Each structure stands twice: as structure tokens, then as C-alpha cells.
Amino acid sequence: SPMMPDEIKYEDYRESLNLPDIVANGALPIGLDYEGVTLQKIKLTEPAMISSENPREIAHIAEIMMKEIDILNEKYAICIADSSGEFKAYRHQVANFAEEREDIKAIHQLMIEDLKQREMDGPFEKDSLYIINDFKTFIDCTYIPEDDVKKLITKGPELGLNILFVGIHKELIDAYDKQIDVARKMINQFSIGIRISDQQFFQREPVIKENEAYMVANQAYQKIRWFK
């Protein structure tokens, strides 16, 4: 009957669980579940939404996501639309980093041109990985049509184009912006850093503590803790 260790540091599990090899095989190792104390992963082969109730937790999410930056760049052309700043520490280590309004607007056109070329000419040698930090502001800069969001989510993965959406839960999942509603209904992979009782879209439920989240997929959830 395994139980969660007092501390679960990324720097230790990286070695004992060979986490760089997890990234090399197409997933981000993010933490352990409370039920089985087994490795939890965000698949880089389908979209995901990663939220937290607290803005300081977004900085930690970014730190864990980007741990194996050399393997990520080996496998992916990475483009980050970061309207908030939590990914700035990696701005020189991705193919494209956009933080100004006009540069974020250009990411919309880039994503569509990327998807189009992959459909016409076939997937590129490296997959494309778009990380959108603050989808609400991304929408404010791009006015990306809901049908463009739909086609990127539905067609992208089979063509080698993937998107990860990161943000505050009330600005990312429980917002009612049209494109957010479309994304949350089509995506089947979530890490939610807030009580299910404290959110709208999805025994007294305990408080969500530091680094804790619910992994949500297939109409089911599991409480986890992200690596430290």
C-alpha cells in the first residue's frame, strides 16, 4: 500500500525513473498520483490544459514542464506564446518566444501555416509544440476563430502539431470565452490545480495544497502531486 513520500523532488526522480527517456518518448513527467504513487505524464501527442488556482503555481508548472529542454528541442520545434512571463527563463531555448502583442498575433498565423504545410506535404522531422501561457490573453491578441481552434486540436496531433494550454483556472477552463469553451470540450487531458468543488466546468473535498492537482481524462480524475 504505497503512500506519497514527504517530498518528491524532480531532481531525484529524474535519475531513479530516467525521466529524460519519458520526454524522449513523447510525454512530460509531471508528478506522482496519491493512489498508487506512480508516474503521471502529460502526453505530447494530444492537447492538454494545465491550470492552477494560484498564479505562483504557474511558475512552478513552467519549471517542471521545461526540465529536459535538450530532449524537448531534439524532438520538437517549440513555440511559446507567453503573455504572463513564467516561461521567460527559456526564451532563448525555443524556436520562437512571443510575449509582445504583435508577436503573439503572429503565432496564430504560424500555427495555421504549420498545420496547412503538414497536411499538404506531410509531418516534419520534428513535431511542433505550441505552449500558450494565458489563453485568455492569447485570444485577446489573435481573435483566433473557434473553428481554427477546433481544427488545430482535431487535425494537429495526427499531423505532428501539438498544443499545451497553461493558465489560471478561472481564466483558462472556467472562462466562457468561446474558444476556451471549444478547447475544454475537445481536450481529454487536464491537470487541474484547484478543488473540483471550487470549479464549474467539470465526503467534504480536502483543500488543494502546494503542487497538488487533479489529473482529468475519460470522465475520471485522480489526485496527484507535481514534482518539486
TrEMBL record:
It comes from the Bacteria. Homooligomer. Interacts with EsaE. The chain holds residues 1248 to 1479 of 1479 of the full protein. Belongs to the EssC family. It is found in: Cell membrane. It comes from Staphylococcus aureus (strain USA300). This is Type VII secretion system protein EssC. Component of the type VII secretion system (Ess). Required for the secretion of substrates including EsxA and EsxB. However, unable to support secretion of the substrate protein EsxC.
